[PDB]
Copies of this chain bind each other. A is one copy, B any other.
Amino acid sequence: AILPLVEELRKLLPEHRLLILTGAGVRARHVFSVGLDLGLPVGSLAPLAASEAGQ
């Protein structure tokens, strides 16, 4: 999925000024699994899930 999307984005660069923002995905669900198992509050899980979006 990434390779065709990268090719489409490549051809969009001369057409638009783009701010591309990525989501988190399944890895945030796992840190939720571990974090909720450890009982961490919602303010603890928010930056943990955000890390997967940055990656």
Contacts and interface: CB of A to CB of B under 8 A. Distances in A.
A1 to B, nearest CB: 28
Interface string A16-32: 11000000000000000
A17 B14 contact: yes
A15 interface: yes
A16 B14 CA distance: 9
A14 B16 CA distance: 9
Nearest to A15: B17
A42 to B, nearest CB: 31
Interface of A: 14-17
3 contacts: A14-B17, A15-B16, A15-B17
